[PDB]
Amino acid sequence: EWLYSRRGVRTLLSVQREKMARLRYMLLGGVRTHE
Amino acid sequence: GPLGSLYKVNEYVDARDTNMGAWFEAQVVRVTRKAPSRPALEEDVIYHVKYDDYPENGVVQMNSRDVRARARTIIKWQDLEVGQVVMLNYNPDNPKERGFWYDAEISRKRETRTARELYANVVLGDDSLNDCRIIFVDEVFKIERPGEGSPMVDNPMRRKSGPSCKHCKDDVNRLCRVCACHLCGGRQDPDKQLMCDECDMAFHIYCLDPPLSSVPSEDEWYCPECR
Ligand SMILES: [Zn+2]
Ligand SMILES: [Zn+2]
Ligand SMILES: [Zn+2]
């Protein structure tokens, strides 16, 4: 399981994207890859 | 023979997530020749795309069947008909709320003097959901047929995704101090609106007093009221 979190001060855009990412990857069955 | 892909470098596309079935806004960064595989040895291309809302995923290699021209044409309510295969908004986690963009076959349409009802069979990752009640009946997109129309290379058609703010319904022509700038209510420059680590409200750097010329380089940030 991979979890992305943009460092530093949070922006509206980063939070808008986090909410979409939560739905996609934590609730609906999307799979984060990372290497 | 020379590569002659349907979609070109820099073209605006939709790219499908094969795990959960949704179509996401992306841009083509490269087109490469796919090594034919046994037994049929069909020729194909791989699209390398970058996703608008998932830049942290970097450049992602896509099967050609999972890329198409960015949706741009809305099928108005009166033109919708049973049997049409369209791209529409649905949220399997919360069907009464906005979610993501999926292929769907319209399966029923009803209209009374008080209500408009649309049902569709929504295609997810590995299965379908039959007879989903579709909330966003005025945001049903035609699926572009390959070759028809011009490539979208600028001036992209914007879609809303994810659950919407209950104050403003994410209406781009409305201000909202709850989900956008707490001071002016404006949606513009979301990359330059700071989020208070206490109250979680948004603030344009240029609406603060004193205004800030850029996003601060700190671990955290708190608004005037929470300081
Ligand atoms: Zn709002
Ligand atoms: Zn503002
Ligand atoms: Zn605050």
UniProtKB/Swiss-Prot annotation, chain A:
Low expression in testis, ovary and thymus. Expressed in embryonic stem and carcinoma cells. Highly expressed in testicular germ cell tumors. One of its GO terms (biological process) is epigenetic programing of female pronucleus. It comes from the Eukaryota. One of its GO terms (molecular function) is methylated histone binding. GO terms for cellular component: cytoplasm; female pronucleus; nucleus. It is found in: Nucleus; Cytoplasm. Mediates binding to H3K9me2 via N-terminal region, while ability to exclude TET3 from the maternal pronucleus requires the C-terminal part. Primordial germ cell (PGCs)-specific protein involved in epigenetic chromatin reprogramming in the zygote following fertilization. In zygotes, DNA demethylation occurs selectively in the paternal pronucleus before the first cell division, while the adjacent maternal pronucleus and certain paternally-imprinted loci are protected from this process. This is Developmental pluripotency-associated protein 3. The chain holds residues 77 to 111 of 159 of the full protein.
Curated annotation (Swiss-Prot), chain B:
Changing E25A: Impaired binding to histone H3 without affecting the protein folding. Residues 6-72 are annotated as: Tudor-like 1. The modification Phosphoserine is found at S150, S161. The record marks C179 as: Histone H3K4me0 binding. Changing D14A: Impaired binding to histone H3 without affecting the protein folding. Residues 196-200, 216-218 are annotated as: Histone H3R2me0 binding. It is found in: Nucleus. The record marks P190, Q193 as: Histone H3R2me0 binding. Phosphorylation at Ser-161 of the linker region decreases the binding to H3K9me3. Ubiquitinated; which leads to proteasomal degradation. Autoubiquitinated; interaction with USP7 leads to deubiquitination and prevents degradation. Polyubiquitination may be stimulated by DNA damage. It comes from the Eukaryota. There is a cross-link at K142 (Glycyl lysine isopeptide (Lys-Gly) (interchain with G-Cter in SUMO2)). The tudor-like regions specifically recognize and bind histone H3 unmethylated at 'Arg-2' (H3R2me0), while the PHD-type zinc finger specifically recognizes and binds histone H3 trimethylated at 'Lys-9' (H3K9me3). The tudor-like regions simultaneously recognizes H3K9me3 through a conserved aromatic cage in the first tudor-like subdomain and unmodified H3K4 (H3K4me0) within a groove between the tandem subdomains. The YDG domain (also named SRA domain) specifically recognizes and binds hemimethylated DNA at replication forks (DNA that is only methylated on the mother strand of replicating DNA). It contains a binding pocket that accommodates the 5-methylcytosine that is flipped out of the duplex DNA. 2 specialized loops reach through the resulting gap in the DNA from both the major and the minor grooves to read the other 3 bases of the CpG duplex. The major groove loop confers both specificity for the CpG dinucleotide and discrimination against methylation of deoxycytidine of the complementary strand. Interacts with DNMT3A and DNMT3B. Interacts with DNMT1; the interaction is direct. Interacts with USP7; leading to its deubiquitination. Interacts with histone H3. Interacts with HDAC1, but not with HDAC2. Interacts with BLTP3A. Interacts with PML. Interacts with EHMT2. Binds hemimethylated CpG containing oligonucleotides. Interacts with ZNF263; recruited to the SIX3 promoter along with other proteins involved in chromatin modification and transcriptional corepression where it contributes to transcriptional repression. Interacts with UHRF2. Interacts with FANCD2. Multidomain protein that acts as a key epigenetic regulator by bridging DNA methylation and chromatin modification. Specifically recognizes and binds hemimethylated DNA at replication forks via its YDG domain and recruits DNMT1 methyltransferase to ensure faithful propagation of the DNA methylation patterns through DNA replication. This is E3 ubiquitin-protein ligase UHRF1.
